[PDB]
Amino acid sequence: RFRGSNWKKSRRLGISLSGTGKELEKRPYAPGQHGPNQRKKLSEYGLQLREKQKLRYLYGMTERQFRNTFDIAGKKFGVHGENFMILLASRLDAVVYSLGLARTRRQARQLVNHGHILVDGKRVDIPSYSVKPGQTISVREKSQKLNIIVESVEINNFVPEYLNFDADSLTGTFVRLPERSELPAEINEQLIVEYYSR
Amino acid sequence: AVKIRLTRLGSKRNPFYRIVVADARSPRDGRIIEQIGTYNPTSANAPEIKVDEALALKWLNDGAKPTDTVHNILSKEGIMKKFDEQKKA
RNA sequence: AUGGAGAGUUUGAUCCUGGCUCAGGAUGAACGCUGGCGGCGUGCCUAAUACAUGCAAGUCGAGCGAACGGACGAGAAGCUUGCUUCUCUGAUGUUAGCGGCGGACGGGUGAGUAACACGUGGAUAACCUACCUAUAAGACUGGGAUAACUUCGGGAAACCGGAGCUAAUACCGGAUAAUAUUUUGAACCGCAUGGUUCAAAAGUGAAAGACGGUCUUGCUGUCACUUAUAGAUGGAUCCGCGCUGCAUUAGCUAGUUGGUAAGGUAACGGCUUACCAAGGCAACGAUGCAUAGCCGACCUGAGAGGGUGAUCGGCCACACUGGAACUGAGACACGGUCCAGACUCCUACGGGAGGCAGCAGUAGGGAAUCUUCCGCAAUGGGCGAAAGCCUGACGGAGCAACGCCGCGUGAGUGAUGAAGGUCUUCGGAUCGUAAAACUCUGUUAUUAGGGAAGAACAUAUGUGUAAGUAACUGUGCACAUCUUGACGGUACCUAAUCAGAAAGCCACGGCUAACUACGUGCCAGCAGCCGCGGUAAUACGUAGGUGGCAAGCGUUAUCCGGAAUUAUUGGGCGUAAAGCGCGCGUAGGCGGUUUUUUAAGUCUGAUGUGAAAGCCCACGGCUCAACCGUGGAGGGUCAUUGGAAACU
C-alpha cells in the first residue's frame, strides 16, 4: 500500500487502511519521510514523489520492480490512457493476512505466501502473479485452518471484479481479467504516467 | 559427422533437442544433411516424431542414417524400415 | 512514426546565438557497508604474457605369421595324490606387428587476414565426391616380403649398428560380367562452347575373415572387399554491392595492357614462352598509407532507421615461426618427417630431439575470467558388428546487486505521560495506543525426517516375430528381466518454528525535501546550478529522529534521454555556428519550355516468402521472477508473373 498499516501507521500512509488510525491521541501526519513534502514528482523537481509511494507500493512492487510493472503497463499497447492502467492495477494484495477476504487483506503479506498454498492446479505461491481463471488461490489443504482462510463467510468475501472466491479454504475464481469496476483508481491514468511520460 | 544427431539446445537444463543427422564432414553445430523437424526426441512424453515425413525419399536414398533408437520409431511411422519396402518396390 | 525539464545555459541586468558538467538508462562491466533465502545468464579484457604439461585423438584376431600366455580335452603322476612338466585344438586376448582408419573436426585462436577474406546476392558451358545412399560383378586374387622368427656391438645416453626371414581383410604377378574407354556419318549453342548421339573394342576384381542356424553359402548375412551411374555431402569457376577507408598520400603502370600456338586446372586462362600498342591505369584520389577474418548481435535517434564482433551465434584464416617435399580423397596439419630459426633439457659428448592455439591452472597480472574443477552420468559424433574410447565436446559443481528479483522488516490494543526530548522568556502534545504484553496468529524464516516422485530414455531377455538367408535364429525387438544421474532421504508433507530465524542513503544548505542546534566564526571543512561559514550556521564536525526508495547506497568508460543544443525528413552563415579583394572561366549542378510514343523504375498483382537479446498471437515453466524456450503469422514484407497517363 504505502509501507504502513493504519493500526499503528495511518500517518505516513496516505492510505494504509488497516486500523483505527493515530489522529486521535497521536498527530496523524507521519513518523517519517512519506508526508506531504517536497518530493520530486511534478514539474520534475516538485512535491509529489511522496505520492509516488501512493503509486508504487499500492500494487506492492518496489521501484525497479514497479518499474517492471509500468513497462508491463506499456505492454498492453492499446489505449495507453486505459489499457496501460487496467493491467498496471490488476494484482491482489487483498488475499494476504489480516482482515476480510477470509481474514486476509490488511497486514498484507505475512502468512498466505505459504509455499504450500496448493492452488487449484499444482502451485502458485505468490499472488504477485495475477491469478488465473479456474486456478483458485487456495491454501495448503493439509495445513488449511487459520484465522485468515475460512473467515470469509463472516468478515468479507469478493475480491475485485471478475475475481471471486469460495469458502472451503477460500478458493479464488479470477474467472475474467479485472476491469476498473472493483479495481482501484488512486493511480492516475494520466498524471501518474505523466511522471513517467510528460 | 554422420549419425542421427540428438543435438544440444536450450538454457540451464532445457535440452530441447532437434531431429537431425549432421553432415558427413560438418560438426554438431555446423551444416547438415537437412533439418527435418523441431522436437526433442528425448522428450519426457515420447520420441514424439514430428518431421518432414515426405523427405524419406531423398536423405535415406542419399546419405542419412539413424542410430539404434529412431530406426524403430521411424518405421512405426512408416519411414526407415519402410524405405526398405520402398526400395523393394 | 508514441518523442521532449536541464539544477542552469554568459553581460550591470533586457534580449539573440552558442555549446555545456549534470540528473536516466543499459553496458564483457567495474569501483567504494554482505543481506531472508533462492534463482538466473554468463565467463583470461589486461595475460595473443611465457606457457610446465598432465591429457591433450583415438577405434578394429570380427583381417593374420596368430608369437606370447592360454581355454578345452589335457599320455605318464612330477607322488606331504594332484599336471595340460605330453599328444594335437592351440579358440578368445597385447595379438609380433603387418593392415582399414581418421586425426583440419567434437577442441582451440583471430596472429594474421584489401581481395569474395568473409557479410551478402547473383551467373556458371566452372565438376569431383576414403567415410555415404541407391541401380548394375562376384565374393578369380603376387604373398616378394613382412614385423612373424632369427642374428651382429655400441655408447648412461638421444638411438643406432651388420646378417638373414612367414600371414593378413596388406597389397600385389595373369584373363573377366555394370553411361566405363573416344573414331567413322551422325546437332547447335551460350560463336567460344556443349550434345552424346556411334560402338562399345575400352571396365576387371576379390576380401576373405568373424560366419548365424544350416547348404560353411545363400548374397559368405555381418563389416570389411572390386567396377559404371548419378546423388547426399561438400567444395566447385564467373559477376554486382560493403569486396577496403584515406591526397598535410597523385599523375599510375611496362609480355605491361591478358587472345593465337606449346604446355593444365573435374573448369579455364601471361601461369612461362614466338606477335601484338606504348599501351593500359588515372585525383571514380588508380598509386600509396592505414586496415581488415565478415554478418547479425545491442542500443536507439519521433519515423527516417541506423552504430552494433567482447561474448553470443553463423561465414574466413592459423595451429612453435619459417621453407622443401611427401603425403591422408584433400594435410603443411590443435597431439605429421628433414630441417634453418629459436631457444629447452640432457649430456657420460656420442648428439639428439623439444614444440600449450585442446582444457585447467603454473610465473604473472588485473576490476575481470572461475577451478593445473566433476565424470561420460546422459546426448554427441570419428573409427569400430559386437564393442570401444575422445571427452578438457557434453552436460553439470562453485563464483557473483556485473544487473536484479518474490519472500524479505508479521498483531496496537489500555495513560495523550506506565518510561522516551533536535531547537526553552518548558505546553503537553511529545521519533508515540509506539511502548511494556502482547488483540490476530503460525508462510517464507530453520526443519527432520516418511522421502516420492523425476528414476524413462538405451540395449540387456530365448518365450519368439520382421528382415528371415534353403529355415529357428546373432541385431531391431511385442515380452521383460526395470536400469538412469554430471542431481535430491532433499523436495511434497507434519507443520516442528514463533509475533519467529529477514532494511540505508545526500543531508539535515535556497535548488538537497532529511532540524535545529551547539565546538562553527569564510577556519575546520560538508562542498551537486549555486553554496555555507566570520559571536544570532540551517550547512564545517556531530548528532534522536532523520530522506528517495529496499537488497536497499553513489559512482566509474560506452550510446542516447537530456538537447531534432546536431539539421531531406530534423542547421543556418551581417552581427551571433558560419557568406568570397575580387571579379573573369571549360566539364558540370542547375539553365524555360510547348506536343507526342515505351512500361524500364515513380504504396508489383498475389502467393513459396522472412536472424535470434529483433516482422502478430498462442503457449508451458518461471518462489513473481531471475529468465527460458515452443508452435502458428510465415507473414502483410524478397523472388515470381504483368502492360499500359498528365514526366521522363
PDB file of N, CA and C (backbone and C1' of nucleotides) in Angstrom, chain C residues 51 319-324 333 337-344 353-357:
ATOM      1  P     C C  51      56.502 -19.546 -25.454  1.00  0.00           P
ATOM      2  O5'   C C  51      55.900 -20.967 -25.056  1.00  0.00           O
ATOM      3  C5'   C C  51      54.662 -21.072 -24.368  1.00  0.00           C
ATOM      4  C4'   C C  51      54.869 -21.325 -22.898  1.00  0.00           C
ATOM      5  C3'   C C  51      54.745 -22.771 -22.440  1.00  0.00           C
ATOM      6  O3'   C C  51      55.999 -23.430 -22.530  1.00  0.00           O
ATOM      7  C1'   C C  51      53.407 -21.378 -21.065  1.00  0.00           C
ATOM      8  P     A C 319      50.019 -22.722 -39.607  1.00  0.00           P
ATOM      9  O5'   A C 319      49.215 -23.769 -38.707  1.00  0.00           O
ATOM     10  C5'   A C 319      49.880 -24.659 -37.806  1.00  0.00           C
ATOM     11  C4'   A C 319      49.839 -24.120 -36.401  1.00  0.00           C
ATOM     12  C3'   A C 319      49.833 -25.162 -35.286  1.00  0.00           C
ATOM     13  O3'   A C 319      50.539 -24.712 -34.128  1.00  0.00           O
ATOM     14  C1'   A C 319      47.714 -24.024 -35.404  1.00  0.00           C
ATOM     15  P     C C 320      50.957 -25.784 -33.000  1.00  0.00           P
ATOM     16  O5'   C C 320      52.018 -25.020 -32.092  1.00  0.00           O
ATOM     17  C5'   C C 320      53.410 -25.272 -32.208  1.00  0.00           C
ATOM     18  C4'   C C 320      54.193 -23.992 -32.129  1.00  0.00           C
ATOM     19  C3'   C C 320      54.609 -23.391 -33.462  1.00  0.00           C
ATOM     20  O3'   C C 320      53.569 -22.658 -34.088  1.00  0.00           O
ATOM     21  C1'   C C 320      56.462 -23.421 -32.005  1.00  0.00           C
ATOM     22  P     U C 321      53.566 -22.454 -35.683  1.00  0.00           P
ATOM     23  O5'   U C 321      54.738 -21.406 -35.940  1.00  0.00           O
ATOM     24  C5'   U C 321      54.623 -20.056 -35.509  1.00  0.00           C
ATOM     25  C4'   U C 321      55.584 -19.142 -36.230  1.00  0.00           C
ATOM     26  C3'   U C 321      55.821 -19.439 -37.707  1.00  0.00           C
ATOM     27  O3'   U C 321      54.831 -18.887 -38.553  1.00  0.00           O
ATOM     28  C1'   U C 321      57.893 -19.229 -36.632  1.00  0.00           C
ATOM     29  P     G C 322      54.500 -19.592 -39.957  1.00  0.00           P
ATOM     30  O5'   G C 322      55.900 -19.608 -40.723  1.00  0.00           O
ATOM     31  C5'   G C 322      56.493 -18.412 -41.213  1.00  0.00           C
ATOM     32  C4'   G C 322      57.816 -18.689 -41.877  1.00  0.00           C
ATOM     33  C3'   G C 322      57.787 -19.752 -42.966  1.00  0.00           C
ATOM     34  O3'   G C 322      57.438 -19.228 -44.233  1.00  0.00           O
ATOM     35  C1'   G C 322      59.503 -20.254 -41.441  1.00  0.00           C
ATOM     36  P     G C 323      57.756 -20.060 -45.570  1.00  0.00           P
ATOM     37  O5'   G C 323      59.337 -19.950 -45.733  1.00  0.00           O
ATOM     38  C5'   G C 323      59.953 -20.134 -46.993  1.00  0.00           C
ATOM     39  C4'   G C 323      60.576 -21.497 -47.129  1.00  0.00           C
ATOM     40  C3'   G C 323      59.718 -22.548 -47.794  1.00  0.00           C
ATOM     41  O3'   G C 323      59.624 -22.374 -49.192  1.00  0.00           O
ATOM     42  C1'   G C 323      60.963 -23.494 -46.010  1.00  0.00           C
ATOM     43  P     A C 324      58.673 -23.340 -50.045  1.00  0.00           P
ATOM     44  O5'   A C 324      59.447 -24.727 -50.028  1.00  0.00           O
ATOM     45  C5'   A C 324      60.540 -24.954 -50.897  1.00  0.00           C
ATOM     46  C4'   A C 324      60.904 -26.409 -50.938  1.00  0.00           C
ATOM     47  C3'   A C 324      59.746 -27.364 -51.093  1.00  0.00           C
ATOM     48  O3'   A C 324      59.205 -27.392 -52.397  1.00  0.00           O
ATOM     49  C1'   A C 324      61.193 -28.195 -49.452  1.00  0.00           C
ATOM     50  P     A C 333      52.069 -26.517 -40.151  1.00  0.00           P
ATOM     51  O5'   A C 333      50.538 -26.840 -39.845  1.00  0.00           O
ATOM     52  C5'   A C 333      50.173 -27.949 -39.030  1.00  0.00           C
ATOM     53  C4'   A C 333      48.763 -28.412 -39.301  1.00  0.00           C
ATOM     54  C3'   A C 333      48.204 -29.369 -38.251  1.00  0.00           C
ATOM     55  O3'   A C 333      46.775 -29.276 -38.215  1.00  0.00           O
ATOM     56  C1'   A C 333      48.346 -30.487 -40.301  1.00  0.00           C
ATOM     57  P     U C 337      56.729 -35.680 -36.327  1.00  0.00           P
ATOM     58  O5'   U C 337      57.468 -36.135 -37.663  1.00  0.00           O
ATOM     59  C5'   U C 337      58.798 -35.707 -37.916  1.00  0.00           C
ATOM     60  C4'   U C 337      59.401 -36.354 -39.139  1.00  0.00           C
ATOM     61  C3'   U C 337      60.635 -35.653 -39.691  1.00  0.00           C
ATOM     62  O3'   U C 337      61.819 -36.070 -39.034  1.00  0.00           O
ATOM     63  C1'   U C 337      59.099 -36.028 -41.448  1.00  0.00           C
ATOM     64  P     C C 338      62.706 -35.031 -38.189  1.00  0.00           P
ATOM     65  O5'   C C 338      63.699 -34.422 -39.272  1.00  0.00           O
ATOM     66  C5'   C C 338      64.458 -35.269 -40.122  1.00  0.00           C
ATOM     67  C4'   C C 338      65.005 -34.523 -41.310  1.00  0.00           C
ATOM     68  C3'   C C 338      65.446 -33.084 -41.063  1.00  0.00           C
ATOM     69  O3'   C C 338      66.753 -32.978 -40.519  1.00  0.00           O
ATOM     70  C1'   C C 338      64.039 -33.144 -42.945  1.00  0.00           C
ATOM     71  P     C C 339      66.988 -32.846 -38.928  1.00  0.00           P
ATOM     72  O5'   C C 339      66.051 -31.639 -38.472  1.00  0.00           O
ATOM     73  C5'   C C 339      66.562 -30.321 -38.306  1.00  0.00           C
ATOM     74  C4'   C C 339      66.713 -29.630 -39.635  1.00  0.00           C
ATOM     75  C3'   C C 339      66.488 -28.123 -39.641  1.00  0.00           C
ATOM     76  O3'   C C 339      67.627 -27.385 -39.260  1.00  0.00           O
ATOM     77  C1'   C C 339      65.103 -29.065 -41.239  1.00  0.00           C
ATOM     78  P     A C 340      67.771 -26.815 -37.764  1.00  0.00           P
ATOM     79  O5'   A C 340      68.512 -25.421 -37.962  1.00  0.00           O
ATOM     80  C5'   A C 340      69.448 -25.206 -39.014  1.00  0.00           C
ATOM     81  C4'   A C 340      69.081 -23.999 -39.836  1.00  0.00           C
ATOM     82  C3'   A C 340      68.616 -22.792 -39.050  1.00  0.00           C
ATOM     83  O3'   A C 340      69.694 -22.048 -38.516  1.00  0.00           O
ATOM     84  C1'   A C 340      67.072 -23.213 -40.754  1.00  0.00           C
ATOM     85  P     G C 341      69.778 -21.731 -36.941  1.00  0.00           P
ATOM     86  O5'   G C 341      69.541 -20.163 -36.865  1.00  0.00           O
ATOM     87  C5'   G C 341      68.647 -19.508 -37.751  1.00  0.00           C
ATOM     88  C4'   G C 341      67.274 -19.364 -37.154  1.00  0.00           C
ATOM     89  C3'   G C 341      67.158 -19.516 -35.659  1.00  0.00           C
ATOM     90  O3'   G C 341      67.721 -18.424 -34.971  1.00  0.00           O
ATOM     91  C1'   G C 341      65.293 -20.486 -36.713  1.00  0.00           C
ATOM     92  P     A C 342      68.999 -18.619 -34.018  1.00  0.00           P
ATOM     93  O5'   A C 342      68.372 -18.542 -32.564  1.00  0.00           O
ATOM     94  C5'   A C 342      67.377 -17.579 -32.268  1.00  0.00           C
ATOM     95  C4'   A C 342      66.164 -18.226 -31.674  1.00  0.00           C
ATOM     96  C3'   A C 342      66.400 -19.098 -30.462  1.00  0.00           C
ATOM     97  O3'   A C 342      66.543 -18.320 -29.290  1.00  0.00           O
ATOM     98  C1'   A C 342      64.988 -20.219 -31.969  1.00  0.00           C
ATOM     99  P     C C 343      68.004 -17.894 -28.770  1.00  0.00           P
ATOM    100  O5'   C C 343      67.829 -17.753 -27.192  1.00  0.00           O
ATOM    101  C5'   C C 343      68.000 -18.867 -26.331  1.00  0.00           C
ATOM    102  C4'   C C 343      66.760 -19.711 -26.280  1.00  0.00           C
ATOM    103  C3'   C C 343      66.846 -20.994 -25.486  1.00  0.00           C
ATOM    104  O3'   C C 343      66.772 -20.801 -24.085  1.00  0.00           O
ATOM    105  C1'   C C 343      65.726 -21.386 -27.521  1.00  0.00           C
ATOM    106  P     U C 344      67.506 -21.825 -23.085  1.00  0.00           P
ATOM    107  O5'   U C 344      66.346 -22.333 -22.125  1.00  0.00           O
ATOM    108  C5'   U C 344      65.089 -22.702 -22.663  1.00  0.00           C
ATOM    109  C4'   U C 344      64.785 -24.153 -22.451  1.00  0.00           C
ATOM    110  C3'   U C 344      65.950 -25.026 -22.054  1.00  0.00           C
ATOM    111  O3'   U C 344      66.378 -24.872 -20.719  1.00  0.00           O
ATOM    112  C1'   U C 344      64.764 -26.110 -23.742  1.00  0.00           C
ATOM    113  P     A C 353      66.999 -35.476 -34.238  1.00  0.00           P
ATOM    114  O5'   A C 353      66.183 -34.219 -33.706  1.00  0.00           O
ATOM    115  C5'   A C 353      64.776 -34.270 -33.559  1.00  0.00           C
ATOM    116  C4'   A C 353      64.385 -34.727 -32.182  1.00  0.00           C
ATOM    117  C3'   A C 353      63.575 -33.730 -31.371  1.00  0.00           C
ATOM    118  O3'   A C 353      62.207 -33.656 -31.768  1.00  0.00           O
ATOM    119  C1'   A C 353      65.385 -34.422 -30.081  1.00  0.00           C
ATOM    120  P     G C 354      60.974 -34.020 -30.805  1.00  0.00           P
ATOM    121  O5'   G C 354      61.127 -33.057 -29.550  1.00  0.00           O
ATOM    122  C5'   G C 354      60.418 -33.339 -28.349  1.00  0.00           C
ATOM    123  C4'   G C 354      60.599 -32.252 -27.323  1.00  0.00           C
ATOM    124  C3'   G C 354      59.601 -31.104 -27.392  1.00  0.00           C
ATOM    125  O3'   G C 354      59.338 -30.613 -26.078  1.00  0.00           O
ATOM    126  C1'   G C 354      61.783 -30.284 -27.800  1.00  0.00           C
ATOM    127  P     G C 355      57.843 -30.652 -25.494  1.00  0.00           P
ATOM    128  O5'   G C 355      57.033 -29.688 -26.467  1.00  0.00           O
ATOM    129  C5'   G C 355      57.094 -28.278 -26.308  1.00  0.00           C
ATOM    130  C4'   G C 355      56.722 -27.566 -27.581  1.00  0.00           C
ATOM    131  C3'   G C 355      55.610 -28.232 -28.398  1.00  0.00           C
ATOM    132  O3'   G C 355      54.801 -27.227 -29.003  1.00  0.00           O
ATOM    133  C1'   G C 355      57.494 -27.945 -29.747  1.00  0.00           C
ATOM    134  P     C C 356      53.497 -26.659 -28.262  1.00  0.00           P
ATOM    135  O5'   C C 356      54.062 -25.941 -26.955  1.00  0.00           O
ATOM    136  C5'   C C 356      53.602 -24.654 -26.561  1.00  0.00           C
ATOM    137  C4'   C C 356      52.098 -24.605 -26.448  1.00  0.00           C
ATOM    138  C3'   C C 356      51.501 -23.322 -25.908  1.00  0.00           C
ATOM    139  O3'   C C 356      51.477 -22.283 -26.875  1.00  0.00           O
ATOM    140  C1'   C C 356      50.422 -25.187 -24.930  1.00  0.00           C
ATOM    141  P     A C 357      50.379 -21.109 -26.802  1.00  0.00           P
ATOM    142  O5'   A C 357      49.074 -21.770 -27.434  1.00  0.00           O
ATOM    143  C5'   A C 357      47.782 -21.389 -26.985  1.00  0.00           C
ATOM    144  C4'   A C 357      46.695 -21.917 -27.888  1.00  0.00           C
ATOM    145  C3'   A C 357      46.742 -23.405 -28.203  1.00  0.00           C
ATOM    146  O3'   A C 357      46.180 -24.183 -27.162  1.00  0.00           O
ATOM    147  C1'   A C 357      46.422 -22.186 -30.200  1.00  0.00           C
TER     148        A C 357
END
